[PDB]
Each structure stands twice: as structure tokens, then as C-alpha cells.
């Protein structure tokens, strides 16, 4: 009898074929295109998409006049259009099945800061967040795997304490200054 | 100790069942009554819930009632004559429920003469010698003699019942549970129930 949780779920799924020549390049292409650490992150976003596809799939099997499909279906749609992976015009569960892995990779924080020009390259965009620079509505984020929403997309900027923003410089800037 | 549980018996199919747990206290049992005939020996038993239970080991008096009439007088239990369960409850003189006994008839006649004013258990030929019995055959007031007339018209008891009044031993039956209640209450046989046990006593004593 301990006051704990013991509730934890996995975020990735290892593929069936370990050395599928066609699959190895399709995941490696997503590595450099979005600047990912290893294949685990590819399988992670692939697993989140697989859950959303299966969640939308079981709803499409029910009748349209079912209140469970109407409520649970709209709630899934509102969350997809909230984060920006799906557009408000294509707000239907049929468009969920057409979502690809790159649709959720674009909503990644390290990619949004690259589309906004705050970073030089996609790999530097990871280090830009890894060094505690990017903030979202005065809330600084350190991990690059953050997902922004549409009501928070136009608030991605530098922190009030980062050298790239407005504040004190880094420790290397102050080190070379005192020695010169 | 003694237990009345069911997990020690065989199933309805005949297969032996293994005990799920050891003997529990809430299913305990205690020895049988075996209430003999003796003066005022009763033990108290603490039971489930802190209550009290009265264990009657030997009792000599019994609060029996009369069936035909409305009379409940405590009388001295003499002996047991027959028991439908087994003849062992009468060879050992054990007072239990639904056993026919031969109880005294002095309290029954004492109230019958004071209410009906009619000799019933008197010997055929002998008269009332003591003066206390002549007061039941005197002349009373107008408001007192009028009520005894309407009571004398309905007094012809069955001939099979008036015979026991001659010997002073009425065939009664313990209608209570002595070991549990602590009191050997009951009633007196009459009608068809009196003829049934008399036939069993006649066969057993024949």
C-alpha cells in the first residue's frame, strides 16, 4: 500500500521488419529533414499518429446519428485544429486518415522556430531550445519536442533572460571580455 | 469444539468437501439439555452478543395449562411416561419438549372447585372430610349463586379426562424447550391428542 501511480504508457513501437530497405530510408529521410536525434523519435510521432488514426477509425464505424460519435468525433477534431496539424476548413474525421507523419513533425517546436527564422538551421533549432532560449507566452521551453497550438503560434519568441533576446549575455561573452 | 457447520459433511452429490478454514467460534455447539427432575438447578450461559441463556439441568415444577378450559397453574412434574422421539428420554427421565408427562392435578382441582363448585376428582363413595371442602357446597348470596348456575351447565368433561383426576396425575405435555428457555412449561392433553398418546402408553405398557 504505497501512495504512488504505477500508470505509464509507451510512446514508440518498434517496426516489424528490422532491416526493411525501403523503410530504413523513409525514416532516415525524416531524420535530417526535421533534425531528429534517432529513430525512436520517428517511431514516437509515428505511434501518436497511429493512435489518432485508430481513434478516428473506430468512430467512423459508428452511425452518424450516434451521439457518442458526434461528441467524441468533434472533440478529436477540435484538438487537431487546435495544435495546427489540421485546418479548420478540413474539419472532418475523413481528413484525419489523410494525415501523414510530417504533418505532426511540422508542429514540433524545433521546426516552428525554424519556419519563423529564429534559428539558422534545423539542427541549430534543437540546440536553440536545448539551451533554454525559446519561450511561449512568457513560458520558456527547453525540450525540442514541444507542440505549439494556433492560439500560441504567434507568441514564439526569445526569453527575457537570453542573450539572443533582451537581457544578460552568455558566460563565454563575459569570459572573453574580462580577459581582454 | 462442537460445531454445527456444513463444510464437514458430504455434498449432495456424495463427494467429500475439503474444509475452507478451521473451526470458527460463531458456529460452535454446546452439550445437550438432558434436563432431569430436580430442585432448582439452572446455569447461565453467555452467548453470541454478550447476552444470557438459561441452562435447565433439573426441574421439578412445571407451569402447565389446561387445554379445554382456561387455566394455567404451576404444578409439580412427577415423571415422564412416553416420548415420541425415543424411549431413552423416558428411561432416563429427561424433560424435553413435546414429551407427555404425568403431572400433578392438585392445582387443577383447587381452581375447578372454586369456579365450578362441582366434585370431579373425588373418589366414588367417599365424601369431603375436611371443612375447607364443604365451603364449596354452601348457600351464597343472590349475586353470587346466579353466576354458578350458568357455569354448571357446561362442565361435563370427557370421560377419558376425568379418570386421571381420580389418581391426581394428569397427562400433560411439555410444550416449551427446557434447555433453552430454562422453564418446563406446557399444557394438558385433551380430545384426540389425549387418546393418541394413551394408546401408545397402553402398547408400551402391555
Amino acid at each position: 500500500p504505497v501512495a504512488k501511480t504505477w500508470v505509464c504508457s509507451k510512446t514508440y513501437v518498434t517496426p516489424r521488419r528490422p532491416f526493411e530497405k525501403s523503410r530504413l530510408d523513409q525514416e532516415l529521410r525524416l531524420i535530417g529533414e526535421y533534425g531528429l536525434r534517432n529513430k525512436r523519435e520517428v517511431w514516437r510521432v509515428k505511434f501518436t499518429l497511429a493512435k489518432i488514426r485508430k481513434a478516428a477509425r473506430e468512430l467512423l464505424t459508428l452511425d452518424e446519428k450516434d451521439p457518442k460519435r458526434l461528441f467524441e468525433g468533434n472533440a478529436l477534431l477540435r484538438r487537431l485544429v487546435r495544435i495546427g496539424v489540421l485546418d479548420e476548413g478540413k474539419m472532418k474525421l475523413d481528413y484525419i486518415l489523410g494525415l501523414k507523419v510530417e504533418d505532426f513533425l511540422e508542429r514540433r517546436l524545433q521546426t516552428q522556430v525554424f519556419k519563423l527564422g529564429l534559428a539558422k538551421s534545423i539542427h541549430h533549432a534543437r540546440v536553440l531550445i536545448r539551451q533554454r532560449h525559446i519561450r511561449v507566452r512568457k513560458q520558456v521551453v527547453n525540450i525540442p519536442s514541444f507542440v505549439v497550438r494556433l492560439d500560441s503560434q504567434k507568441h514564439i519568441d526569445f526569453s527575457l533572460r537570453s542573450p539572443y533576446g533582451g537581457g544578460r549575455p552568455g558566460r563565454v561573452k563575459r569570459k572573453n571580455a574580462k580577459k581582454a | 469444539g462442537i460445531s454445527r457447520d456444513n463444510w464437514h459433511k458430504r455434498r449432495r452429490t456424495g463427494g467429500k468437501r475439503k474444509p475452507v478454514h478451521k473451526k470458527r467460534k460463531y458456529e460452535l455447539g454446546r452439550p445437550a439439555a438432558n434436563t432431569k427432575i430436580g430442585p432448582r438447578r439452572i446455569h447461565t450461559i453467555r452467548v453470541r452478543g454478550g447476552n444470557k441463556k438459561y441452562r435447565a439441568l433439573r426441574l421439578d415444577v412445571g407451569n402447565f395449562s389446561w387445554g379445554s378450559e382456561c387455566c394455567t397453574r404451576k404444578t409439580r412434574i412427577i415423571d415422564v411416561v412416553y416420548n415420541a422421539s425415543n424411549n431413552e428420554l423416558v428411561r432416563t427421565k429427561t424433560l424435553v419438549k413435546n414429551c407427555v408427562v404425568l403431572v400433578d392435578s392438585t392445582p387443577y382441582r383447587q381452581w375447578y372447585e372454586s369456579h365450578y363448585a362441582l366434585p370431579l376428582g373425588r373418589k366414588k363413595g367417599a365424601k369431603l372430610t375436611p371443612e375447607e371442602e364443604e365451603i364449596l357446597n354452601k348457600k351464597r348470596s343472590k349475586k353470587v349463586q346466579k353466576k354458578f348456575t350458568l357455569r354448571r351447565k357446561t362442565a361435563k368433561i370427557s370421560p377419558l379426562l376425568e379418570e386421571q383426576f381420580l389418581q391426581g396425575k394428569l397427562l400433560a405435555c411439555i410444550s416449551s424447550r427446557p434447555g433453552q428457555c430454562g422453564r418446563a412449561d406446557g399444557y394438558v392433553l385433551e380430545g384426540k391428542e389425549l387418546e393418541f398418546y394413551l394408546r401408545k402408553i397402553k402398547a408400551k405398557k402391555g
Binding site: 500500500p1 504505497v2 501512495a3 504512488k4 501511480t5 451521439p67 458526434l70 461528441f71 472533440a75 | -
Partner: protein, 261 residues
């Protein structure tokens, strides 16, 4: 299994308390009292979680040890009092008069001052037991014993009794058309009007309750808690009597109000 149990795990507690699973292992086991353990709310929760006036379990003790709370006007000291249904919790030190009443769902709400109504309550009679020499008895809701009942009251009606004298003032007969607040799960807090009563010899009887917007359903006879004669209640109701806004309807109100604030 050797006798009575004196502990209550937090995950084993009734869901109507909404306790934090990451703070402790045990739930506040409500002290023995007038109400069932499954249909009550420990006095600590109502003072620490609902009202938030207590921060820990020792500070709520200081509430009862200073004689400020008083259920039905009688100051209690057990921080785990049942405080079941219709139990008026008046606070004369703070002027607040709470009644633990259910919401559209099954939960204990913070229903505030009802001074002119809090002086009494409603009680569901259970049985009509005959005492000595022909004196009937009535067992009320919160274990309050009332004697000398009217010969017209049955085992299903409701009565109102003042907190001081504890005498039956008025009663509401049970028939098709009386306002009711269904209790017993999946309808706890749904306020409606009784419409039908099915009879089952040897088992439970079925009754049908129709809410304000026509949300008619069915339930057992032992689930009726009459609260008003006809369609008018006696005591103040919380925000939403028995409307029971659906998941889609509750969704509409939350988005339309947050955008304005």
C-alpha cells in the same frame, strides 16, 4: 474478518469525494452515524476540500475543537461525521448555513446560506413500527426518531422537522405528480416529477421520474426522495436542479463563457 473494519483506503473511497491519489494511501473513513458510508461526506472533506477552509487534517480538528461547526444546530466534535443528505450544516460563528445537496451529477455541493429554510430539513420515512399499547413509530432519514405519527402517513412519504423541536410540521404524500430528487446512482441529483409506479409482488417496485425538460426514465421505488408537493420545492436548490446538461450541452456553455471573461 474477525470483527469490524476501521480503515478505508483512498482508492476504495466513494468517487463523490475526488481525493488526490498522490498524497496519502487512506481515505477519511466517516465515523459511524445516521447515514450510510457510501451516501455521506466526511466532515473533514467538506471543511478541507470543498470549503478549503482547512489545509491539513489537523487544522480541521481545530474547527471542531473550538465549537464552531454545528450540524442541525448541534455542535459536533468528530471530524469524520457522516453529514449525509439534507443535513443542514449551519455555522453561526461565520453566518454561513450550508446544506449538503447533490448536483446534476452525484457530488456534494457547497450550497450556501438558506437561513429561513435551513431551520428544518426533509426526511424519508423507512418503516412504521408499532410500540406498546398501539403507539406507532417512524424512522426518519438521518436516524432521527419521531413518535406519535399521523395515521395518514405511509412508509414512502417525506416530512419536515425543525432543528430545535424536531416535530413533524408538514408532509408530502407519495403519488404520481410529486416533485422528487432521485437518489441511488446514475440519477443522484436528477430532480423531476414522479409519473408512474409499477408494482412487483415480492421484489422491488419500479417508478418513473420526468425531469424539467422531459428527460423521463425509470428507477426503483426505494430511490424516490420527494422534495416538493407537485412542482414547487421547499428548500433552495443548487445551480441546475435536474436539467442534466449533456456532454455536448456542457461543452457549449464552457466555450461561450470563457470567451467573454
Amino acid at each position: 474478518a474477525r470483527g469490524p473494519k476501521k480503515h478505508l483506503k483512498r482508492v476504495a473511497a466513494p468517487k463523490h469525494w475526488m481525493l488526490d491519489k498522490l498524497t496519502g494511501v487512506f481515505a477519511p473513513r466517516p465515523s459511524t452515524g445516521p447515514h450510510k458510508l457510501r451516501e455521506c461526506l466526511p466532515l473533514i472533506i467538506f471543511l478541507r476540500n470543498r470549503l478549503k477552509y482547512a489545509l491539513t487534517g489537523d487544522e480541521v480538528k481545530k474547527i471542531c475543537m473550538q465549537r464552531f461547526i454545528k450540524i442541525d444546530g448541534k455542535v459536533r466534535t468528530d471530524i469524520t461525521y457522516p453529514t449525509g443528505f439534507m443535513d443542514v450544516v449551519s455555522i453561526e460563528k461565520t453566518g454561513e448555513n450550508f446544506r449538503l445537496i447533490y448536483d446534476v451529477k452525484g457530488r456534494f455541493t457547497v450550497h450556501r446560506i438558506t437561513n429561513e429554510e435551513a431551520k428544518y430539513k426533509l426526511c424519508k420515512v423507512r418503516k412504521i413500527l408499532i410500540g406498546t399499547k398501539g403507539i406507532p413509530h417512524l424512522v426518519t432519514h438521518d436516524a432521527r426518531t419521531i413518535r406519535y405519527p399521523d395515521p395518514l402517513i405511509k412508509v414512502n412519504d417525506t416530512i419536515r422537522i425543525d432543528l430545535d423541536t424536531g416535530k413533524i410540521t408538514d408532509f408530502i404524500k407519495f403519488e404520481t405528480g410529486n416533485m422528487c430528487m432521485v437518489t441511488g446512482g446514475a440519477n443522484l441529483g436528477r430532480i423531476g416529477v414522479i409519473t408512474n409506479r409499477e408494482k412487483h409482488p415480492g421484489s422491488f417496485d419500479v417508478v418513473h421520474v420526468k425531469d424539467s425538460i422531459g428527460n423521463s426514465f425509470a428507477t426503483r421505488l426505494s430511490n424516490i426522495f420527494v422534495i416538493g408537493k407537485g412542482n414547487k420545492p421547499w428548500v433552495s436548490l443548487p445551480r441546475g436542479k435536474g436539467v442534466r446538461l449533456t456532454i455536448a450541452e456542457e461543452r457549449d456553455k464552457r466555450l461561450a463563457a470563457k470567451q467573454s471573461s
